Design a protein around this ligand. Structure first.
Ligand SMILES: Nc1nc2ccccc2[nH]1
Length: 155
């Protein structure tokens, strides 16, 4: 059915990944990658690049598509169609703003308990350079009712 396009960008380097603690809005209190809605007349990749700069202060060269995840919240008519990207070549330094507080995390210290619960399923694939298609059904913001997750050759 009808789905709204979102982007999600993980700045993932060999020994660390950047996450930002979302200060306000839906899902505040959790460490997120950077992203959001795509604009009219904007390609998905261009929106991910824009949202990364807007939210982290970072400029990136190459963006690699690594996943597509569809989220359903029970009772909510709009599905979230989230296009996940990764990058390791960035320019700039992340900046705390009144919307997000950024921190680098060692790969063995990902704060899964303070992240969206679906991250525990697909972040491991992201970390092993796998690509994936995912679907997660939520009841509220805390409980996964069911899900599917499949490794793919083409996102
Ligand atoms: N990983 C992740 N980021 C999300 C943002 C909104 C709803 C569900 C989500 N799962």
């Amino acid at each position: 059915g009808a789905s709204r396009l979102y982007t999600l960008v993980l700045v993932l380097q060999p020994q660390r990944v950047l996450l930002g603690m979302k200060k306000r809005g839906f899902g505040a209190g959790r460490w997120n990658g950077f992203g959001g809605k795509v604009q009219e007349g904007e390609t998905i990749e261009d929106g991910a690049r824009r949202e990364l700069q807007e939210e982290s202060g970072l400029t990136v060269d190459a963006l690699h598509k690594v996943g597509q995840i569809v989220f359903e919240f029970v009772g909510e008519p709009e599905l979230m169609d989230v296009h996940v990207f990764c990058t390791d070549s960035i320019q700039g330094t992340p900046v705390e703003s009144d919307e997000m507080r950024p921190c680098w995390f060692q790969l063995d210290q990902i704060p899964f308990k303070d992240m969206w619960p679906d991250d525990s399923y697909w972040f491991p694939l992201l970390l092993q350079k796998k690509k994936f298609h995912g679907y997660f059904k939520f009841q509220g913001q805390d409980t996964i009712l069911d899900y599917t997750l499949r490794e793919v050759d083409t996102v």
